[PDB]
Design a protein around this ligand. Structure first.
Ligand code: ADP
Lengths: 54, 128, 50, 38, 374
């Protein structure tokens, strides 16, 4: 019984799984595969340049 | 035939059961209500369907309720005199402008349950 | 004859009361199955897209 | 306009299903009740 | 409020059903006929009965002429309708009409005067505190229990298809066809002539209706069934008349309901019920059609023929695109479904807001019914 194991209405942030478009399903996975926001912040040489420029 | 059998099951169980419970309860309550007023004279009915056939007790009940003198019943023990005795009470009800629908003497004489119960209910609605 | 009539009436009532439970179980089994149908087709569509 | 004229707004859809299920359950229990007393 | 339950009255052309709210089954079910005597009355002292109405009008049908107050869903004679309503309220249920509100059902596309006269009769004479008028095919969806679907209701007077998506009904896609079991009974009475049986009186029409209800079915393939009936005699069945005579219906069994799918047997130019349902589906928008394909609901007593669902599914599948999945939902209790929906509608706590009060009628005349209801 998988259907007893979990309930769609128990968790809203599991309820988000059911109502996804397929291209929206790729966009999240690809974009957190890339981790661009982590890359920009972790890399210093571009970072203090952006800091001081602002 | 399977769904036909299921439909016959549904309309054999529920439609019969609810109607029979309601009419049994109504029969007991109407019997008590008639017995309360019929106890002023020395008269008492055990079964509503059977004792109301001859038409004498209907005349006695209408005489007790209304308060004036109805014509005395036809002196007989046949089916025709029975029909006459029921028709006298029905015509006396036609005096009081009480509205009776699908009510005949033969319906009371034969002992149709629903029409007898409706007649008693109409009498109760009038004379209360 | 009268006694036989009323005892068989009791048997008939008991047996229709038995049949109603099978009716209910059939209905709720089908209502359980159709959402499994709707689940597998959506998840297979996701698999093909991937 | 007035598309929602015949019905009231902001009603919970779950209540109708629950009462329909209750009427359904009355058949399975087949409890026999008399009519309301006048 | 809690103990008081509004009466639910389903009022079709063929039979009248009545009961209390919150009940699974109606208390009183009886045919809607009004009969009157025609012969001599010679026995003195039997009493006078001017009119016979209801089930006991059927029992003495030998000496009566029978009239139907409702024809094609329209109340042609109103006095007989008052007789039926009085017999329902007093003899059948034994309830005072002042105590409880009344819920009524009707066809979708009807003349306005029918609704106005219904409201006027139920307020002026029976003196009811509240009353509501609803559509039968909408109540069928309440009985089914789903938000969306298309309802094809076929009774004794009229057939109609309404689509509903997410609780919203499309008025322009509602379709009405004047092809019901009444015309099927007339067609069966016509086609029984060629085997030597003649039924002409109004009393024999009930016998023909009983024959139709007992020995009729819908063939899945018309031409193959006709070839089978011509080849062999295994399809023949026997029926016993009330006078003891025996008739053999034979080939006619699958020919009487076939007029539902091909109206050209009756001379009508209209389309069949399957084509009517398909056209009602395609009159809606593009997006909802898939859902309307998945929740087709059958209702009414005319859809009680054996094999109607398989033939309907096959015809709709043939008309519809192949990539869609077509299923027909027909509960075993589809004769009473409308009434059940009415009870479900009558017991809701929200619906207590939507009753038409007597004061509102006193202010607005009989025209209040169009502003409320539907
Ligand atoms: N068991 C049955 N099999 C086939 N047809 C039936 C059956 N019962 C009723 N009918 C048809 O349905 C008609 C009655 O329909 P009904 O449900 O009374 O319509 P409404 O209630 O809307 O007037 C009858 O005239 C008959 O033609």
């Amino acid at each position: 019984e998988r259907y007893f194991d979990r309930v769609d209405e128990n968790n809203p942030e599991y309820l988000r799984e059911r109502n996804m478009a397929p291209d929206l399903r790729q966009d999240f996975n690809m974009m957190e595969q890339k981790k661009r926001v982590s890359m920009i912040l972790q890399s210093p040489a571009f970072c203090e340049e952006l800091e001081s420029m602002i | 035939d399977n769904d036909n059998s299921s439909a016959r099951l549904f309309e054999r169980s529920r439609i019969k059961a609810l109607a029979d419970e309601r009419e049994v309860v109504q029969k007991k309550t109407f019997t008590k209500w008639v017995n309360s007023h019929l106890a002023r004279v020395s008269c008492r009915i055990t079964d509503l369907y059977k004792d109301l056939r001859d038409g004498r007790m209907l005349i006695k009940l209408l005489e007790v309720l209304s308060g004036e003198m109805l014509p005395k019943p036809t002196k007989g023990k046949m089916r025709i005199h029975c029909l006459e005795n029921v028709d006298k009470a029905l015509q006396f009800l036609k005096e009081q402008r009480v509205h009776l629908e699908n009510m005949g003497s033969h319906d009371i004489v034969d002992g149709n349950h629903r029409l007898v119960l409706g007649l008693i209910w109409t009498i109760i609605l009038r004379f209360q | 004859s009268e006694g036989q009539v009323r005892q068989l009436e009791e048997q008939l009532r008991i047996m229709d009361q038995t049949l109603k439970a099978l009716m209910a179980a059939e209905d709720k089994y089908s209502q359980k199955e159709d959402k499994y149908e709707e689940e597998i087709k959506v998840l297979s569509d996701k698999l093909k897209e991937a | 306009a007035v598309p929602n004229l015949f019905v009231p707004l902001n009603t919970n859809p779950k209540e109708v299903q629950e009462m329909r299920n209750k009427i359904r359950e009355q058949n399975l229990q087949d409890i026999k009740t008399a009519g309301p007393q006048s | 409020d809690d103990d008081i339950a509004a009466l639910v009255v389903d009022n079709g052309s063929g039979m009248c059903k009545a009961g209390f709210a919150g009940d699974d089954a109606p208390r009183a079910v009886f045919p809607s006929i009004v009969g009157r005597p025609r012969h001599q009355g010679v026995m003195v002292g039997m009493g006078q009965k001017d009119s016979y109405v209801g089930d006991e009008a059927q029992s003495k049908r030998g000496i009566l002429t029978l009239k139907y107050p409702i024809e094609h869903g329209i109340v042609t004679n109103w006095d007989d309708m008052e007789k039926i309503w009085h017999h329902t309220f007093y003899n059948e249920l034994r309830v005072a009409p002042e105590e409880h509100p009344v819920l009524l059902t009707e066809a979708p596309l009807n003349p306005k005067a029918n609704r106005e006269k219904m409201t006027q009769i139920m307020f002026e004479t029976f003196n009811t505190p509240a009353m509501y008028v609803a559509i039968q095919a909408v109540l069928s969806l309440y009985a089914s229990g789903r938000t969306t679907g298309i309802v094809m209701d076929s009774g004794d007077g009229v057939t109609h298809t309404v689509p509903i998506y997410e609780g919203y009904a499309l008025p322009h896609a509602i379709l009405r066809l004047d092809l019901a079991g009444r015309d099927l009974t007339d067609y069966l009475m016509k086609i029984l002539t060629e085997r030597g049986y003649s039924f002409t009186t109004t009393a024999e029409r009930e016998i023909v209706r009983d024959i139709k209800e007992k020995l009729c079915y819908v063939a899945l393939d018309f031409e193959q069934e006709m070839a089978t009936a011509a080849s062999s005699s295994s399809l023949e069945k026997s029926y016993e008349l009330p006078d003891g005579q025996v008739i053999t219906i034979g080939n006619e069994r699958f020919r009487c309901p076939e007029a539902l799918f091909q109206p050209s047997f009756l001379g009508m130019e209209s389309c069949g019920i399957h084509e009517t349902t398909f056209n009602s589906i395609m009159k809606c928008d593009v997006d909802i059609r898939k859902d309307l394909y998945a929740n087709t609901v059958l209702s009414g007593g005319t859809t009680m023929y054996p094999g109607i669902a398989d033939r309907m599914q096959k015809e709709i599948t043939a008309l519809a695109p192949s990539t869609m999945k077509i299923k027909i939902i027909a509960p075993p209790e589809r004769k009473y479904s409308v009434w059940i929906g009415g009870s479900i509608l009558a017991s809701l706590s929200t619906f207590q807001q939507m009753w038409i009060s007597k004061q509102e009628y006193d202010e607005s005349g009989p025209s209040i019914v169009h502003r409320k209801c539907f």
